[PDB]
């Protein structure tokens, strides 16, 4: 029954990641191998100007400094996610049918190792891909923020770096996106039980589905867990500089949604 039920099963969830991603990591590649650079003051202006963002710019607080614009940038990208990600497991049947406040509580506390982890699909040693694919930031001007904005995006490419190094596809992506979403160690989650079944069932449609799809990748398995654990800490980290910035740029605003996610 398991192999080809779990087939079936992972197919349904690859559908899915791939009618609520718009950049899959196959369209990133094609393109990190004609976008517009953005390493410095002038280009991003020139960006702003003449690349099409998802989030227009007079929707967003008033311009004071590179680094301040920046960080809001990244919570506008965030949002966007999360919003795709949210999609992306109400098409999870068994997602769906876990109660409401349930669905919302695995989104509120999975979506950031999701963002992280999706994120290494665009992102080199070199920059990260923005805009729809239309741009391309360098790490070195993400390096160039002052303090304490610099830091928090640094520990994502390291990360990242060493994620893609695993050569995962988006069919492998797919299944292990969907795996952090339902995890049954999320605090005051209802029904542990029956998130923690459809996990396993996931983590198991995702342990065969490396064999047909990477026989000759050996631990690739083990190895990917190991990153669903390095992915919490990454996260907890950020949280952490997440709120050295509420606390000592109080000037600076959060997104409502992302106030909500860390409400905590
Ligand atoms: C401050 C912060 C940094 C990250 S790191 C990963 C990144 S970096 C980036 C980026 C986009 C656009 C630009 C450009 F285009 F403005 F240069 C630069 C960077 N979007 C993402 C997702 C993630 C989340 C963040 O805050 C929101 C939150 O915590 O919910
Ligand atoms: C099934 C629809 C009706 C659900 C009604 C119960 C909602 O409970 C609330 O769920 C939230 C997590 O989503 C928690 O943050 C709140 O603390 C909790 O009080
Ligand atoms: C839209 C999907 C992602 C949403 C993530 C944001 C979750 O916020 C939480 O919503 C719960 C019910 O409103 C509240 O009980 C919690 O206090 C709050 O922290």
């Given amino acids: 029954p398991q192999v080809a039920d779990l087939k079936a099963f992972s197919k349904h969830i690859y559908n899915a990641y791939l009618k609520n991603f718009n950049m899959t990591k196959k369209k990133a590649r094609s393109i990190l191998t004609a976008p517009f650079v953005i390493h410095d003051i002038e280009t ?12 227009l710019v007079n929707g967003l607080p008033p311009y004071k400094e590179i680094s301040v614009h920046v960080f809001y940038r990244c919570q506008c990208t965030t949002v966007e996610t ?4 949210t999609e992306f497991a109400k098409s999870i049947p068994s997602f769906s049918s876990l109660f409401l406040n349930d669905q919302v509580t695995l989104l ?3 979506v950031h190792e999701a963002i992280f ?16 694919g239309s741009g391309f930031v360098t790490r070195e001007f993400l390096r160039s923020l002052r ?6 995006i640094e520990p994502k490419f390291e990360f990242a770096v060493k994620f893609n190094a695993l050569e ?14 339902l995890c049954g160690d999320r605090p005051g989650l209802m029904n542990v039980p029956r998130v923690e079944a459809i996990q396993d069932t996931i983590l198991r449609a995702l342990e065969f589905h490396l064999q047909a799809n990477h026989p000759d990748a050996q631990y690739l398995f083990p190895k990917l867990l190991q990153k669903m654990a390095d992915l919490r800490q990454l996260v907890t980290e950020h949280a952490q500089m997440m709120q050295r910035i509420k606390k000592t740029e109080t000037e600076t605003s959060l ?6 996610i860390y409400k905590d």
């Fill in 44 to 55: 991003l202006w020139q960006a702003e100007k003449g690349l099409v963002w998802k989030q």
């Fill in 82 to 85: 999360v919003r795709e990600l």
């Fill in 108 to 110: 509120k506390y999975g």
């Fill in 117 to 132: 982890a999706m994120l290494a699909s665009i992102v080199n040693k070199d920059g990260l891909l923005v805009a729809n």
């Fill in 147 to 152: 303090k304490p904005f610099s830091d928090i």
């Fill in 168 to 181: 995962l596809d988006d069919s492998d992506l797919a299944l292990f996106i969907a795996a952090i979403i």
């Fill in 255 to 260: 997104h409502p949604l992302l106030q909500e």
